[PDB]
């Protein structure tokens, strides 16, 4: 059923795809604000020991909600908090309480405000909280790699999380494409291996089909230490992720 799951994920990621360039329609918030919000969400997930899939789901919910709705400066953190709460409820075994998120917002919003924003996001998303993420496709690709290098997986997760910060240009790439580009970049970085033939057959993505996302992700990886948001780099510095953020990105991609 694994191939059926991959096909269903590829079909579903289109239906859960956020509108491309919705920040242009937003009159009050900009992509820098979204990057700051995603950095704070990474920090929050680290604080409450949330899984990476929860963070990816929260980012997807925020992107879709802001595609469908207009949010001011003072409500962007409320939207992010509601998305984090919804993702934790959907994914975590024991999601944090609403009071935990109210506290983690430095009491910017009350519990009633957080619950109202959660209701608004659920109404906007129409309870479509099962959106495929880069994490799921990355795990599916990890199931098709041998030998199973843990450094490859950690670097792929690091790059996939890095893709969440910048809406430009990672909102025009499907999560499967981003996951494939991250897997290839990690494989070339730590082992020098390219996009596997097994994944070529499974996903249909040749090394040329990932080339734009590959260049964008290589640029992000090279410029990661200089990025204004550094929460992901600190998070992946630990021995849990083998310290992949300390690894030197390849200077060039032999494509």
């Amino acid at each position: 059923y694994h191939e059926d799951i991959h096909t269903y994920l590829r079909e579903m990621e289109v239906k859960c795809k956020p509108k491309v360039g919705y920040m242009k329609k937003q009159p009050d918030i900009t992509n820098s604000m979204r990057a700051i919000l995603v950095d704070w969400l990474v920090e929050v997930g680290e604080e409450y020991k949330l899984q990476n899939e929860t963070l990816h789901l929260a980012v997807n919910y925020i992107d879709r909600f802001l595609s469908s709705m207009s949010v001011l400066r003072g409500k962007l953190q409320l939207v992010g908090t509601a998305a984090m709460l919804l993702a934790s409820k959907f994914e975590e075994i024991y999601p944090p309480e609403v009071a935990e998120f109210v506290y983690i917002t430095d009491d910017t919003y009350t519990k009633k405000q957080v619950l109202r924003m959660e209701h608004l996001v659920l109404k906007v998303l129409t309870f479509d909280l099962a959106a495929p993420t880069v994490n799921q496709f990355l795990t599916q690709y990890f199931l098709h790699q041998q030998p199973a290098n843990c450094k490859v997986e950690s670097l792929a997760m690091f790059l996939g999380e890095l893709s969440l910060i910048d809406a430009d240009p990672y909102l025009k790439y499907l999560p499967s494409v981003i996951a494939g580009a991250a897997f290839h970049l990690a494989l070339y970085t730590v082992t020098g291996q390219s996009w596997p033939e097994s994944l070529i057959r499974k996903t249909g993505y040749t090394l040329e089909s990932l080339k734009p996302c590959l260049m964008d992700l290589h640029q992000t990886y090279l410029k990661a230490p200089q990025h204004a948001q550094q929460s992901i780099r600190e998070k992946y510095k630990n021995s849990k992720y083998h310290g992949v953020s300390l690894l030197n990105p390849p200077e060039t991609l032999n494509l």
Partner: peptide
């Protein structure tokens, strides 16, 4: 830490 009110403005 992770507890902060983001001043987006």
């Amino acid at each position: 830490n992770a507890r902060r009110s983001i001043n987006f403005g």
